[PDB]
Design a protein around this ligand. Structure first.
Ligand SMILES: CCCCCCCCCCCCCCCCCC(=O)OC[C@H](COP(=O)([O-])OCC(O)COP(=O)([O-])OC[C@@H](COC(=O)CCCCCCCCCCCCCCCCC)OC(=O)CCCCCCCCCCCCCCCCC)OC(=O)CCCCCCCCCCCCCCCCC
Ligand SMILES: CCCCCCCCCCCCCCCCCC(=O)OC[C@H](COP(=O)(O)OCCN)OC(=O)CCCCCCCCCCCCCCCCC
Ligand SMILES: CCCCCCCCCCCCCCCCCC(=O)OC[C@H](COP(=O)(O)OCCN)OC(=O)CCCCCCCCCCCCCCCCC
Ligand SMILES: CCCCCCCCCCCCCCCCCC(=O)OC[C@H](COP(=O)(O)OCCN)OC(=O)CCCCCCCCCCCCCCCCC
Ligand SMILES: CCCCCCCCCCCCCCCCCC(=O)OC[C@H](COP(=O)(O)OCCN)OC(=O)CCCCCCCCCCCCCCCCC
Ligand SMILES: CCCCCCCCCCCCCCCCCC(=O)OC[C@H](COP(=O)(O)OCCN)OC(=O)CCCCCCCCCCCCCCCCC
Ligand SMILES: CCCCCCCCCCCCO[C@@H]1O[C@H](CO)[C@@H](O[C@H]2O[C@H](CO)[C@@H](O)[C@H](O)[C@H]2O)[C@H](O)[C@H]1O
Ligand SMILES: CCCCCCCCCCCCO[C@@H]1O[C@H](CO)[C@@H](O[C@H]2O[C@H](CO)[C@@H](O)[C@H](O)[C@H]2O)[C@H](O)[C@H]1O
Ligand SMILES: CCCCCCCCCCCCO[C@@H]1O[C@H](CO)[C@@H](O[C@H]2O[C@H](CO)[C@@H](O)[C@H](O)[C@H]2O)[C@H](O)[C@H]1O
Ligand SMILES: Nc1nc2c(ncn2[C@@H]2O[C@H](COP(=O)(O)OP(=O)(O)OP(=O)(O)O)[C@@H](O)[C@H]2O)c(=O)[nH]1
Ligand SMILES: N=C(N)NC(=N)NCCc1ccc(I)c(Cl)c1
Ligand SMILES: [Mg+2]
Lengths: 174, 47, 320, 95, 51, 140, 98, 115, 112, 347
């Protein structure tokens, strides 16, 4: 069952998505997006990208903290909805869990499944590379190249973040 | 029924169908979901 | 350079020109209350530009050669006819008030433009902010209809919102019985037909709506008949005002640039004074409209844009 | 590109990341480097219409390297067959 | 072309500005004391808060 | 859609009219549902039952036009022994328009529907015989 | 494909359906946009890491950068919608029917 | 496995302490005890009512600035490149632009809380 | 050549005559713009600002000269590509033997 | 808004569009779209009113959704091709998602619902950018991926756009909403010919941009946003009514005006490919566009509607608007048909 770690995490990934896609109160929607960002970190980390997985987890922790503050200010009501409080929320939540459950059940039983498309259920390990013995991290060298190869990328993203500051000040001024 | 009166009436009738909307974000994006579904389920535009 | 974003970028900013003396002053009061005398004397002592009260022919005085045009080019609206038969079938009563508000609207834009571009204050006699008192007086007396007031409020709503109110609202209080008497001494036969109920409605509007409203946003100085006579004592009150309220405290060069862009473009100022609302009193049929517009372009100096009419002496047109 | 200013000005704004056989930091090769090289060199200069037919052999191999779908069917069939024998007592995996 | 569904439609404002609403921008009310370190124990300071 | 249209097109005209009705009723029923889905989504019904009731009407009406066309057209083919005749579809297309008029309870609509649906159906048969392409494949 | 791809694509589809099926809170839907990025980030990262396509290792980072710009712009509009109406309900944003 | 064992142990022990805390003490529950606290008087309105955010603009800016650190974190690795001329320029270019946006928001009064 | 308005090979084509009727038309469009510019701004249409009216004719002619030069080049390229292809594939463009109407049979349709 | 800030943002709207058009990498194309969206929202919110806020929100939600389907298509393409080059996609699902993403960005039916509402809710000058400059980036992508586009999908979007654009405009009195449904109808023509001759997609896009700018610039000139206010123009600037009549007849595609050129050349390329029914259907359905263009001519130029007394005050003031390029654009909108062979420069 440990050879299926990446699949188990991906199951929780979907459960988190169903958690906030059913759209309860954004307080709980934020929590589900945090859980998905946590296992998502673990999924990416298990393919050799510890930096990428840790970054997305860190970035989404900051984003959801601001969303929480905005929720208490602009998206609250007397009785915030949990997943059981509303039929539409519960119905959407139940439907997602059942769809995920039957996908997991059949892919595990057959070691293969067709959910619209063909997916192989042998486990994710089978596709891994077999010949790693370099004395560095390939993810790090690729990311570190943003400052040498990716001059043009640095310019457009750097400009866009500056414009983002300018634009949010225009939008939010009366 | 090549009458101008009938032709102009069908366009009038069709014009009211197209334009008489509620202006609600929720209903528009709901119809997007319907369009995507049938684009695959009914016409196999995805293949 | 004509004023615009480029000129603003290069340094032309309203805060440079403006000072502690860049003020917009308005003198209000009933009819024959002494406004004009007081306003003219305030302007000289403080060294401000004086705009006489905007009449029917104010627009003429700012375009062309400055002389009044024949009345058919202002719609035949007449003040005298209003006093003779204010309940006329031809709707002259509301056509006048609608025209007068547009004239006041244009004068306010000119006044603001003078202040912003040169920094010098201005003195006005009534304004778009007090023009409604005549509307209410007309309605109470049954001179105009409910629809006309609705139309007036539509136009006022989408035009007065763009501007800033005066810094100072000088007001002269002269009770109706004295106003009555001061009218006969004027000797205009048409004015003497004015009823006192009409003048009372004017007073009630000023003291009922105008002054209470303008107190929250401007400095309001009220003077009696004799108080108003010493213009020097009025100027003394103005010179020591605190100026600590109203929207002028919130104005920065970004806002005053946008404001100055509006007031220098007169067709943008007057845009909504002709909204397509078809009241009988202000609607003109196609044939009358077309025929009069042909006459207007036949007036000296009016066929072409100013500076391109060589029937009045313009030169170098082939290089302009 | 709609306007190939990069190839006009001799400037490389983004062609360096377009393919995985491009020059990588410290000469670290992608897993499917050989297949992509072979497919790209086959189809160079003849256009997509010809390449779709004439470079099919190289593209299917490259596709096989990328997604490994035929490899997993070969391994899935063996793993399923082996367990079908385990119960029947017809196979003993080696030590 | 008028219909039953569009009967309630009205032309937009001439200047494209709809009047500001007052849907309730209410303040938060808080009992600051009496039982409170900074209220000296017998001060019920009823305090209307925006943030 | 391709499958149902192929089934209708890939069986000989005028033979086995009970099958053809299955194909044209399926096309009609499907079109009625597509209208129901967009109509229900864009014009929210007041209740669940109204939304289902509206869906039933559109799906029934569209399917009824589909069945009658596929039946009227095929019966005339065997009756007249003219399998490859656009005239058969003109009758089949008109019969559909009459049903639309009855379901909409409007002679004017029923009269207009016949002319447009009858002539549209007749043109479709000509297109099949002549090889007319609606969405033509790029060639030059 | 691998069985992890089944779940990540499922996650993207779930958040897309959550996005297209609005309720009331505009904030709830802005979350679904953030979710859709998260699934796209994970799926892109897996493909790039598994193929060992080194230079592409930086584009998931770039993906996140413009997700924040997109989220920040969305929150800026939500603030302005809330100021006008006092809630973030999307049913209030229907003036432009007429 | 070491890390997952460490995480499982940490949160298990925390959960165990909560379980003891709730099942070991003697409970005495009634309405007045569990009512919300507000210094002795009953609260006025719900605590779920909107709470104005006066730093809303800074919070949005935090999003854009928090992504910058994700772009700047790889810099210790970027310093190993042979192409040191390019990285140093681009590293400094990014930081300067981050400084420019702070200067723009500062000067425009974006850092001051609304009233 | 990629992203070149006029590739180098276009120089071996004869440039458009400055008396090209199409160019004369482009100059006429420039003149019409100048008159419209006077009209919308309520200036004397024919006389006002001849310096401005002149820059209209010149700018239209200047821009229109190079558009015409590239137009001609792109049709020359089309023909060059087409004729070369016909030379590369003789079997797809065979030379039929043309019969005379004395031999070819055509049906007669009387108009009665 | 500060004038320098307005210029910088406006250049960023253009910069994002340029990035899309010069990029060879799908990620940079996606970046160009995000940059363009980030810079156009502040131009919609410029006048700060509840209608601008609504329009900006509806625009952001539609564009943000489309961008997400675009990126999904890109990643699927990377999965099945291991490359990022902007060209034909290598997966039919990727093509469908990218095609729908670009249809949403363009506002093509049935993804069209936002175009009339966003256009109505923003100032005329912002609507001009929306209905013209914002078409360039999505079209430049379609121009490059059309070999893998599903023919049934693209032609269905074309047909629906022409019908819905034609029908939607019949019910409108707001000029900004008439231009929105006109835009939807014209997008259908550009994509209808794209599978057959992409050069004619460019020709139709260019001429549409010229004519659309000409109309918006003349609406801006008199600050008119409704039919009735536009009907007062004859009593202010008679010349402006003749220019509007000529441009509206051209948009309607009447010979011998410029706007007939795209319809003429698109019909030609489709009949070379044995497509007779579709271009015949498209031309007849375009008569819907001509009908609600003709009404604007009747109330503007060919009759004289009632005026108001205050209109006389406007006679004394000259037009002050910049009206940039209006003399040149109006001549290009009407008198280009004799120079049609010049279309080969786009080849
Ligand atoms: C891979 C799998 C795919 C991935 C997704 C898997 C599922 C995981 C969850 C995904 C997130 C789902 C988000 C759900 C959501 O937020 O919707 C809120 C949405 C509106 O929320 P609300 O504001 O609280 O309104 C509640 C009332 O409906 C409002 O009151 P009312 O007045 O509208 O009540 C009358 C109601 C009655 O409806 C009818 O008119 C009857 C028509 C039925 C015709 C048959 O009217 C309607 O709602 C008509 C719209 C119905 C939808 C259009 C159907 C066509 O709720 C719904 O409309 C029902 C959805 C709940 C079930 C979700 C199941 C998802 C499956 C989608 C299709 C997947 C295809 C693949
Ligand atoms: C790509 C694949 C998509 C193919 C289908 C494209 C159709 C897209 C149509 C979307 C725009 C339609 C807008 C419209 O027609 O209005 C909504 C309409 C309401 O109709 P309804 O309320 O039921 O009848 C009222 C009678 N007084 O609801 C409808 O009935 C529209 C149904 C149109 C289906 C076609
Ligand atoms: C256009 C003015 C007429 C006004 C009435 C409008 C008529 C309908 C317009 C709709 C479009 C149809 C245009 C028909 C003319 C285009 C065909 C053509 O004339 O091509 C040849 C022309 C040069 O002419 P050329 O080579 O000398 O041979 C014929 C000379 N009689 O090469 C050209 O195409 C360029 C010349 C265009 C023709 C107009 C300009 C003539 C020169 C006067 C400019 C002042
Ligand atoms: C060899 C050239 C043959 C000419 C071919 C003309 C083809 C149409 C060209 C379209 C451009 C026309 C000029 C643009 C309008 C400007 C003129 C105007 O608006 O009013 C007329 C004006 C006189 O009025 P005013 O305002 O007082 O100016 C004082 C100057 N005397 O100015 C004048 O006195 C005369 C200015 C020209 C008047 C143009 C008349 C309208 C032409 C457009 C109608 C359609 C043209 C015919 C269509 C078939 C195309 C051949
Ligand atoms: C070749 C076609 C080019 C057509 C250009 C048209 C010029 C723009 C219209 C000129 C009228 C004067 C004007 O003010 O335009 C409106 C707008 C300026 O904004 P405005 O609100 O009026 O003033 C600033 C206050 N924010 O002006 C603008 O912001 C310009 C927006 C339109 C520019 C794009 C036009 C379509 C694409 C052109 C490139 C083709 C490739
Ligand atoms: C060359 C090959 C290509 C051929 C294609 C066809 C070319 C057409 C190009 C059209 C370009 C627009 C140029 C139109 C110029 C018309 C001249 C004009 O506008 O009339 C002058 C007058 C201007 O008024 P104003 O400047 O304010 O001075 C006071 C005078 N009233 O205005 C008025 O006062 C008139 C007010 C009454 C309105 C009457 C409207 C009916 C006349 C319409 C004629 C124009 C029709 C254009 C459509 C195409 C025609 C073929
Ligand atoms: C709006 C919702 C969007 C949700 C997105 C959902 C995820 C989309 C997954 C895209 C990948 C689907 O993958 C699809 O299945 C298999 C993959 O081997 C392929 O299968 C098909 O093509 C290949 C050709 O080489 C062969 O297997 C075979 O000819 C055929 O079966 C399809 O060509 C491919 O399109
Ligand atoms: C036969 C093959 C070719 C035929 C082509 C004919 C297409 C139609 C051309 C005319 C279109 C006119 O469009 C519109 O038609 C109707 C009637 O017809 C007119 O409407 C008029 O007739 C109707 C009914 O007769 C009256 O209720 C209405 O009061 C009256 O205004 C509209 O004022 C006109 O604007
Ligand atoms: C062979 C190809 C034929 C091409 C036809 C070209 C399409 C032309 C489309 C015109 C459609 C709009 O035209 C519209 O027709 C209806 C017909 O009733 C008219 O409507 C008229 O009759 C109805 C009732 O019958 C009245 O309620 C309405 O007050 C009256 O005006 C509209 O006033 C007109 O605007
Ligand atoms: N109906 C109407 N009459 C107006 C308006 N403004 C001025 N008038 C009239 O114009 C005439 C002169 O203006 P007044 O200032 O009020 O009278 P006055 O004699 O000049 O007395 P002074 O205030 O000292 O200038 C008065 O008879 C007014 O009734 C107006 O906005 N509406
Ligand atoms: N129809 C296409 N898909 N391609 C296209 N636009 N032209 C293809 C043929 C062509 C036509 C004119 C010229 I001038 C040239 Cl050089 C080449
Ligand atoms: Mg006076």
């Amino acid at each position: 069952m440990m050879l299926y770690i990446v699949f188990i995490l991906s199951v929780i990934f979907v459960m988190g998505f169903v958690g906030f896609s059913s759209k309860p109160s954004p307080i709980y929607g934020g929590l589900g997006l945090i859980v998905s960002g946590g296992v998502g970190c673990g999924i990416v980390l298990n393919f050799g990208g510890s930096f990428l997985g840790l970054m997305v987890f860190l970035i989404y922790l900051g984003g959801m903290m601001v969303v929480f503050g905005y929720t208490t200010a602009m998206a609250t009501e007397q009785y915030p909805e949990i997943w059981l409080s509303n039929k539409a929320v519960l119905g959407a939540f139940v439907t997602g869990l059942l769809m995920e459950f039957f996908m997991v059940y059949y892919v595990l039983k057959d070691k293969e499944v067709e959910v619209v498309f063909e997916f192989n259920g042998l486990g994710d390990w089978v596709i891994y590379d077999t010949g790693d013995s370099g004395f560095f991290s390939e993810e790090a060298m690729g990311i570190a190249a943003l400052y040498s190869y990716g001059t043009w990328l640095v310019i457009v993203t750097g400009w866009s973040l500056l414009i983002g500051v300018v634009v949010i000040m225009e939008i939010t001024r009366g | 029924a090549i009458l101008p009166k009938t032709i102009s009436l069908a366009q009038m009738k069709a014009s009211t169908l197209v334009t008489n909307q509620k202006g609600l974000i929720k209903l528009y994006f709901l119809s997007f979901l319907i369009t995507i579904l049938i684009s695959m389920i009914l016409f196999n535009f995805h293949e | 350079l004509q004023y615009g974003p480029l000129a603003y970028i290069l340094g032309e900013k309203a805060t440079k020109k403006m000072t502690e003396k860049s003020k917009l002053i308005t003198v209000d009061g009933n009819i024959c209350s002494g406004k004009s005398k007081l306003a003219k004397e305030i302007a000289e002592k403080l060294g401000l530009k004086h705009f006489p009260e905007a009449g029917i022919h104010y627009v003429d005085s700012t375009t062309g050669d400055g002389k009044p045009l024949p009345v058919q080019f202002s719609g035949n609206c007449s003040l005298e006819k209003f006093y003779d038969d204010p309940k006329s079938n031809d709707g002259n009563s509301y056509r006048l008030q609608a025209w007068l508000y547009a004239s006041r609207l244009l004068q306010y834009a000119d006044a603001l433009e003078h202040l912003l571009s040169t920094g010098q204050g201005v003195v006005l006699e009534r304004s778009i902010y007090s023009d409604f008192v005549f509307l209410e007086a007309m309605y109470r007396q049954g001179f105009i209809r409910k629809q006309c007031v609705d139309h007036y409020n539509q136009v006022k709503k989408v035009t007065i919102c763009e501007y800033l109110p005066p810094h100072v609202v000088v007001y002269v209080d002269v009770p109706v019985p004295e106003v009555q008497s001061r009218i006969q001494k004027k000797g205009n036969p048409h004015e003497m037909k004015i009823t006192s109920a009409y003048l009372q409605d004017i007073e009630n509007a000023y003291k009922g709506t105008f002054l209470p409203e303008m107190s929250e946003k401007c400095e309001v100085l009220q003077y009696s008949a004799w108080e108003a006579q010493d213009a020097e004592k009025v100027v003394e009150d103005i010179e020591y005002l605190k100026y600590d309220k109203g929207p002028w405290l919130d104005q920065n060069d970004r806002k005053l640039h946008k404001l100055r862009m509006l007031v220098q473009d007169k067709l943008e100022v007057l845009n909504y004074t002709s909204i397509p609302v078809f009241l009988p009193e202000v609607t003109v049929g196609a044939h009358q409209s077309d025929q009069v517009f042909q006459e207007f372009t036949e007036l000296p100096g009016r066929k072409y844009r100013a500076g391109y009419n060589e029937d009045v002496g313009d030169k170098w047109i082939w290089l302009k | 590109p709609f306007f190939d200013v990069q190839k006009r000005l001799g400037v490389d704004l983004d062609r360096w990341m377009t393919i995985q056989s491009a020059e990588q930091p410290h000469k670290i090769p992608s897993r499917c480097h050989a297949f992509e090289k072979e497919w790209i060199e086959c189809a160079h200069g003849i256009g997509s219409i010809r390449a779709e037919k004439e470079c099919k052999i190289e593209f299917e191999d490259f596709r096989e390297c990328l997604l490994r779908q035929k490899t997993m069917k070969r391994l899935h069939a063996i793993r399923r067959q082996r367990e079908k024998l385990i119960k029947e007592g017809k196979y003993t995996p080696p030590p | 072309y008028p219909t039953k569904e569009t009967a309630h439609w009205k032309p937009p404002p001439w200047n494209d500005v709809d009047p500001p609403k007052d849907t309730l921008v209410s303040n938060l009310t808080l009992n600051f004391g009496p039982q409170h370190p900074a209220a000296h124990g017998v001060l019920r300071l009823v305090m209307e808060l925006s943030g | 859609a391709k499958t149902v249209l192929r089934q209708y097109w890939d069986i000989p005209e005028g033979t086995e009219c009970h099958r053809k009705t299955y194909a044209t009723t399926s096309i009609g029923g499907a079109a009625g549902l597509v209208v129901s889905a967009y109509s229900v989504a864009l014009k929210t019904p007041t209740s669940f039952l109204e939304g289902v009731a509206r869906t039933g009407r559109y799906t029934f009406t569209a399917a009824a036009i589909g069945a009658i066309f596929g039946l009227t057209s095929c019966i005339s083919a065997q009756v007249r022994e003219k399998p490859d005749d656009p005239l058969n579809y003109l009758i089949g297309g008109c019969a559909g328009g009459l049903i639309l008029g009855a379901r909409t309870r409007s002679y004017g609509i029923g009269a207009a529907a016949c002319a447009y649906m009858g002539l549209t159906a007749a043109l479709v048969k000509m297109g099949q015989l002549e090889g007319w392409q609606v969405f033509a494949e790029p060639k030059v | 494909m691998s069985m992890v791809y089944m779940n990540i694509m499922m996650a993207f589809t779930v958040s897309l359906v959550g996005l297209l099926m609005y309720r009331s809170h505009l904030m709830s839907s802005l979350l679904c946009l953030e979710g859709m990025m998260l699934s796209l980030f994970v799926m892109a990262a897996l493909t790039i890491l598994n193929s060992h396509f080194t230079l592409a290792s930086m584009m998931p980072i770039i993906l996140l950068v413009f997700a924040a710009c997109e989220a920040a712009l969305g929150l800026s509009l939500l603030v302005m919608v809330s100021n006008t109406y006092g809630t973030d309900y999307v049913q209030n944003l229907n003036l432009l029917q007429c | 496995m070491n890390l997952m064992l460490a995480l499982l142990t940490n949160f298990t022990l925390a959960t165990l302490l909560v379980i003891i805390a709730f099942w070991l003490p003697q409970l005495n529950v009634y309405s007045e005890k569990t009512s919300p606290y507000e210094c002795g008087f009953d609260p006025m309105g719900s605590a779920r009512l909107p709470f104005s955010m006066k730093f809303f603009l800074v919070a949005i800016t935090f999003l854009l600035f928090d992504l910058e650190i994700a772009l700047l974190l790889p810099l210790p690795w970027a310093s190993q490149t042979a192409n040191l001329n390019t990285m140093l320029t681009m590293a400094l270019f990014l930081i300067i632009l981050l400084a420019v946006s702070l200067a723009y928001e500062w000067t425009q009064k974006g850092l001051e809380w609304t009233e | 050549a990629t992203f070149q308005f006029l590739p180098d090979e276009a120089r071996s084509l004869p440039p458009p005559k400055l008396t090209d009727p199409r160019l004369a038309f482009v100059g006429f469009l420039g003149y019409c713009s100048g008159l419209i510019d006077n009209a919308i701004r309520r200036r004397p249409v024919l006389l006002a600002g001849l310096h401005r009216q002149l820059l209209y004719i010149t700018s239209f002619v200047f821009v229109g000269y190079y558009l015409l030069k590239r137009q001609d080049y792109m049709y020359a390229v089309r023909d060059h590509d087409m004729f070369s292809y016909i030379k590369s594939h003789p079997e797809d463009f065979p030379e039929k033997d043309k019969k005379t109407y004395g031999e070819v049979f055509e049906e007669f349709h009387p108009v009665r | 808004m500060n004038p320098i800030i307005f210029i910088i943002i406006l250049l960023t709207i253009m910069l994002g569009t340029i990035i899309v058009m010069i990029s060879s990498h799908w990620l940079l194309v996606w970046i160009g779209f995000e940059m363009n969206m980030l810079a156009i929202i502040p131009i919609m919110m410029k006048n700060h009113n509840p209608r601008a806020t609504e329009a900006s929100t509806k625009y952001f939600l539609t564009q943000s959704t489309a961008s997400m389907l675009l990126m999904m298509a890109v990643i699927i393409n990377l999965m099945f091709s291991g490359q990022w080059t902007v060209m034909k996609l290598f997966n039919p699902m990727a093509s469908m998602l990218m095609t729908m993403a670009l249809a949403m960005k363009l506002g093509m039916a049935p993804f069209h619902f936002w175009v009339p509402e966003v256009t109505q809710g923003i100032p005329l000058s912002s609507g001009l950018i929306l209905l013209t400059w914002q078409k360039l980036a999505p079209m430049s992508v379609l121009y490059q991926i059309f070999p893998s586009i599903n023919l049934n999908l693209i032609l269905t979007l074309s047909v629906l756009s022409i019908l819905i654009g034609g029908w939607g405009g019949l019910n409108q009195t707001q000029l900004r909403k008439i231009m929105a449904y006109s835009s939807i109808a014209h997008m259908g023509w550009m994509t209808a010919v794209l599978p057959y001759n992409p050069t004619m997609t460019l020709l139709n896009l260019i001429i549409y941009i010229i004519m659309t700018s000409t109309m918006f610039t003349m609406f801006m000139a008199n600050s008119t946003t409704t039919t009735l206010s536009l009907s007062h123009t004859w009593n202010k600037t008679p010349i402006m009514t003749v220019l509007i009549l000529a441009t509206l007849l051209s948009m309607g595609g009447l010979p011998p005006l410029s706007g007939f050129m795209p319809k003429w050349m698109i019909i030609q390329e489709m009949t070379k490919n044995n497509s007779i029914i579709l271009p015949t259907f498209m031309a007849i359905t375009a008569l819907l566009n001509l009908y609600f263009y003709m009404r604007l001519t009747y109330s503007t130029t060919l009759t004289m509607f009632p005026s108001t007394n205050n209109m006389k005050m406007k006679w004394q003031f000259p037009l002050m608007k910049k009206m940039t390029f209006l003399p040149t654009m109006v001549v290009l909108s009407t008198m280009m048909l004799p120079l049609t062979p010049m279309l080969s420069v786009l080849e």
